[PDB]
Design a protein around this ligand. Structure first.
Ligand SMILES: C[C@H]1O[C@H](O[C@H]2[C@H](O)[C@@H](O)[C@@H](O[C@H]3[C@H](O)[C@@H](O)[C@@H](O)O[C@@H]3CO)O[C@@H]2CO)[C@H](O)[C@@H](O)[C@@H]1N[C@H]1C=C(CO)[C@@H](O)[C@H](O)[C@H]1O
Length: 890
């Protein structure tokens, strides 16, 4: 019943007779999922298999065209397969057309100069099996088979490619941006669309980015990863005979396989290929506020003052498109003048500001508008292929004189008001200068130095590329590269073709080299194409490292940006989904992510929002954002009870920051994960393979959120190790056990894994005041493991600090009743530049209050006063009275 490989996934025309017309068998079923049409025999035949020291290659040919000609596109013949043993832990196999040169995804990866696999170290082996044509990847370690495409269905036609594989288990994690219902994916007959579209998160709905990458767990605790470097419109299909099926619409099958043995190891190797996450500015680790519909310039300032009055910490203040004049890029609303004043005032207190940008530029404007005009001069806009005019979409920008009724039909609004806009082609060496310029002159206004906005980071959005008309504008598109492209993957609005909510597929773009591409192949690449330049733009203009949040992603996208999970709604299910989203994104190679706290779409409710601020207080990207007409949902818009709660939890986060920052350093340097599923640190425990309603920050910080309304308690899992409550210092004392811990409406549960030391620092009102206060230690000893730890210090904003010069790297270790410090490299904390070392806490020291050594060394040796409770292992040791800094301490 499984093993049935759906022969008719087509949008239209599945029928007994139409089914027979391919080499296929029609047989109804009463079981949900099973394909009425299925494969009984193959249509390609592998021929000249050959192996060598460094790879393998066979040839694939039709047999015969009688049936291959019967489905989607004109099949390609013959094909060719090249497997390559890059490293011992990594593979690639590609199936392509050796004759014609097919579209291949233009995103740089790093690969050993030549194949560096060694017969003794190589951890996997491959076999090109012959009947029917198959590919079998195996972990040499223990025979588990990683990939096995010796199933039927393999097709390969210009605009339709199918390949399948048995999964080595019933546990698979993560696919290209959408709203999964659990971390581990179902397998019980589910298809998923993958294609950049402006879709609020939804079940089986294709969303902002595309990520054809998964991690599979094996029989034993072993793990592997698989990437399909294809950017065409595709959908994947999970069958209960553990096995999935790709159906792309026309690249080549370029697969890369990774078999680090562990989840982290896998990710380290995936990111090693596509690139590791961007290092973020220390200030971005703080809390963030925004909304769609900040009315007046001053309604923001009103908010920023209300927030410092409540003493709720936060470093980043935004403004949505409201600050633009009629949603035009690079313009300042009348209603928002002396907004430039607000920026400068806030940053002066130590805050920072992030501004949104859309990609589409309006060209129906009457006044002068350099952005658009110089756009046309430098020729940076996306046109049709036969020289044809700009491909005109519509988005946010309003027409010039039109008077706007905020309440009109959303459709009516799009014809009467919204201007025609052009989409820049961000591949082009030209579009880079143009874009980078506009950004320059936003920062330093050539004409009105008083109207300069001094932003610190950019939020590129609406870049799928999203558009509020299907394709182009007035007459439409004209093409079959667009609608019904032989196979229309299982996307949202399938009936609308690929055109739906974006550019015409025939739209011409130009790659950096200079060759011509149509939007059809690079659509999923669009937002990605825009990411690096924007990143660079911010860097050049601000002279600092800065940060970029983008909506549309693609593998490697996270190399220059972070990501927020998009248009959630203020509903309870959406909290848990954010935990997933984050987790999945760590896999996808993007460390800096989160959801819109309290919920974008719709009005926030009180209790849900107390719970969400507590959860979100631990997103790496912690931002409270919100759609237009809704009521405001920020912390100082509820009541005294709320405010006070918000304060406490935010404080906690501003304490973890030195830890959260080093994680970010380690993910950037090592490939490791930041938001990390328990199962990454405790694989041998199968209970964790399924838990997705709680998560880790790094290895030692266990977050256990309350995700249900009335609930004021929670049941959370606690793997086999010591879990110290972060607040009290006491070990919970569960071990591979489920405990029900009390969870009052003011409290969120956090625990520190025994065997780790966490560097902390006193909570300020923003990271500027914070970095000045006292540095702490939390040594979470475990009878289960003594203690290990890391700290990395930086000016927190300079470009490539680690990579060239000024940083501080210290590993910490506690063997016997004593913690010792080893500075690996120091170059920013010097005698003159001191790091105040405040307190030193130690949890789990013993019920016997007897020390053999109570005094700390700096070179000299003091025996400062301490507090100790025998009941609770805590051993506190204040030191706010010494000249102790991280650079002279031992
Ligand atoms: C702010 C948001 O506006 C537009 O969102 C539209 C969505 O495209 C559609 O999904 C559509 O229906 C959704 C409903 O609005 C919503 O109530 C939900 O419950 O389900 C519906 C899905 O069927 O209507 C939406 C109109 O509001 C736009 O497409 C979307 O991309 C916009 N979000 C971005 C815009 C802003 C402002 O620049 C940013 O603040 C957001 O973060 C962006 O994500």
């Amino acid at each position: 019943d499984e093993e049935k490989i759906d022969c008719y996934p087509d949008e239209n025309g599945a029928s007994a007779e139409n089914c027979t017309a391919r080499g296929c068998i029609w047989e109804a079923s009463n079981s949900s999922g099973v394909p009425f049409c299925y494969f009984v025999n193959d249509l390609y035949s592998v021929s000249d298999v050959q192996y060598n020291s460094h790879g393998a290659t066979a040839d694939i040919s039709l047999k015969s065209s009688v049936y291959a000609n019967a489905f989607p596109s004109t099949p390609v013949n013959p094909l060719r397969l090249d497997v390559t043993y890059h490293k011992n832990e990594m593979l690639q196999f590609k199936i392509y057309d050796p004759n014609k040169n097919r579209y291949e995804v233009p995103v740089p990866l790093n690969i050993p100069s030549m194949p560096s696999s060694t017969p003794e170290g190589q951890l996997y082996d491959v076999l090109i099996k012959k009947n029917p044509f198959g590919i079998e990847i195996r972990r040499k370690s223990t025979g588990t088979i990683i990939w096995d495409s010796q199933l039927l269905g393999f097709t390969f036609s210009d605009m339709f490619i199918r390949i399948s594989t048995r999964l080595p288990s019933k546990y698979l994690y993560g696919f290209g941006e959408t709203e999964h219902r659990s971390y581990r994916r179902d397998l019980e007959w589910h298809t998923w669309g993958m294609f950049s579209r402006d879709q609020p998160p939804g079940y089986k709905k294709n969303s902002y980015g595309v990520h054809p990458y998964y991690m599979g767990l094996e029989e034993d605790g072993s793990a592997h990863g698989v990437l399909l470097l294809n950017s065409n419109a595709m959908d994947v299909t999970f069958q209960p005979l553990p096995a999935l099926t790709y159906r792309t619409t026309g690249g080549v099958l370029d697969f890369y396989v990774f078999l680090g043995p562990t989840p982290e190891l896998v990710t380290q190797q995936y990111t090693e290929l596509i690139g590791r996450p961007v290092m973020v500015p220390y200030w971005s680790l703080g809390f963030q506020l925004c909304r769609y519909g900040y009315q007046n310039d001053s309604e923001i300032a009103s908010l920023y003052d209300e927030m410092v009055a409540a003493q709720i910490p936060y470093d980043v203040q935004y403004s949505d498109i409201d600050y633009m004049e009629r949603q035009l890029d690079f313009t300042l609303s009348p209603k928002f003048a002396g907004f430039p004043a607000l920026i400068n005032r806030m940053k002066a207190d130590g805050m920072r500001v992030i501004l949104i940008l859309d990609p589409a530029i309006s060209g129906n404007e009457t006044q002068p508008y350099p952005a658009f005009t110089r756009g046309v001069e430098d020729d940076v806009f996306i046109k049709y292929p036969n020289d044809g005019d700009i491909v005109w979409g519509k988005v946010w920008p309003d027409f010039p004189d039109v008077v706007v009724n905020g309440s009109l039909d959303w459709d009516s609004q799009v014809e009467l008001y919204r201007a025609y806009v052009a989409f820049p082609d961000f591949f082009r060496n030209s579009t880079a200068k143009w874009w980078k310029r506009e950004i320059e002159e936003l920062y330093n206004n050539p004409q009105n130095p008083e109207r300069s906005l001094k932003f610190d980071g950019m939020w590129i959005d609406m870049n799928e590329p999203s558009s509020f008309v299907n394709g182009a504008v007035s007459p439409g598109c004209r093409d079959a590269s667009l609608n019904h492209p032989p196979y229309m993957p299982h996307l949202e609005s399938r009936d609308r073709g690929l055109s739906s909510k974006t550019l015409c597929m025939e739209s011409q773009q130009i790659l950096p080299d200079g060759s011509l591409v149509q939007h059809y192949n690079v659509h999923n690449l669009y937002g990605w194409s825009q990411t690096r330049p924007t990143y660079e733009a911010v860097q050049e203009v601000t002279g600092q490292r800065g940060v970029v949040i983008t909506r549309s992603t693609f593998p490697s996208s996270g190399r220059w940006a972070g990501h927020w999970l998009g248009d959630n709604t203020a509903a309870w299910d959406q909290l848990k989904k954010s935990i997933i989203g984050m987790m999945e994104f760590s896999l996808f190679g993007i460390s800096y992510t989160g959801a819109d706290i309290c919920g974008f779409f719709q009005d926030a409710e009180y209790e849900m929002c107390v719970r969400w601020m507590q959860l979100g207080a631990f997103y790496p990207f912690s931002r409270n954002h919100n759609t237009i007409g809704t009521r405001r949902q920020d912390p100082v818009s509820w009541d005294v009870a709320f405010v006070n709660i918000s304060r406490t939890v935010l404080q906690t986060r501003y304490t973890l920051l030195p830890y959260l920052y080093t994680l970010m350093h380690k993910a950037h340097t090592e490939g490791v994960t930041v938001v990390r599923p328990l199962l990454h640190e405790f694989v041998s425990d199968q209970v964790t393979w399924d838990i997705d309603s709680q998560f880790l920050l790094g290895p030692a910080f266990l977050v256990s959120p309350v995700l249900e309304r009335n609930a004021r308690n929670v049941t959370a899992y606690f793997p086999r190790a010591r879990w110290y409550d972060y607040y009290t210092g006491v070990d919970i004392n569960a071990r591979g056990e489920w405990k029900t811990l009390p969870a009052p409406l003011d409290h969120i549960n956090l625990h520190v894994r025994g065997g780790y030391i966490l560097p902390w620092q006193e909570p300020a009102l923003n990271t500027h005041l914070s970095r000045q206060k006292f540095m702490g230690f939390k040594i979470a000893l475990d009878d289960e493991g003594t203690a290990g730890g890391w700290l990395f210090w930086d000016d927190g904003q300079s470009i490539d600090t680690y990579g060239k010069g000024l940083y501080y790297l210290a590993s910490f270790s506690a063997s016997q009743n004593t913690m010792q410090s080893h500075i690996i490299f120091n170059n920013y904390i010097t005698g003159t530049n001191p790091l105040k070392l405040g307190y030193i806490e130690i949890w789990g020291v013993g019920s016997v209050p007897v020390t053999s050594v109570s005094i700390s060394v700096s070179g000299m040796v003091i025996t400062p006063s301490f507090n100790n409770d025998p009941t609770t292992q805590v051993l506190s040791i204040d030191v706010t009275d010494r000249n102790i800094s991280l650079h002279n301490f031992t």
